[PDB]
């Protein structure tokens with residue numbers, strides 16, 4: 508497992524029932540979010556840990572063909588079959604770092 512980026516973001520998941528974003532893992536705050544490349548089998552995952560307490564708040568596969576939506580310069584989103592994820596980045600630089608790496612993984616897959 509090699510990290511290909513680190514970016515600061517508040518990791519959100521969408522509550523489909525109540526139609527609002529909610530903090531991933533339960534508590535609002537910023538995480539260090541990586542994309543990890545499993546060099547062995549050429550897979551990628553998003554893993555993020557809260558800065559305060561190290562809680563893993565996201566651990567999710569990036570499948571080939573994923574549609575990554577850059578809604579604003581600091582809020583990006585994507586889906587899986589269960590959840591919609593949103594990253595509210597700490598700065599535009601962090602958003603550019605993470606989107607660059609995500610776009611790279613999706614070209615590589």
Ligand SMILES: COC(=O)[C@H]1CC[C@@H]2C=C[C@H]3CCN(C(=O)[C@@H]4CC[C@H]5C=C[C@]6(CCCN6C(=O)[C@H](Cc6ccccc6Cl)NC(C)=O)C(=O)N54)[C@@H]3C(=O)N12
Pocket residue numbers: 521527528574575576578579582584585586591592595
């Ligand atoms: C308290 O108020 C807040 O929540 C504030 C502060 C935090 C955050 C920051 C910023 C803006 C940016 C706008 N935005 C939203 O949520 C927007 C507005 C419209 C609303 C409608 C649907 C949403 C939610 C569920 C997924 N989806 C979609 O659009 C998805 C997007 C998508 C498109 C293609 C591939 C994958 C995906 Cl995933 N479409 C599809 C077909 O799946 C969505 O995100 N929405 C954020 C926002 O308001 N807020």
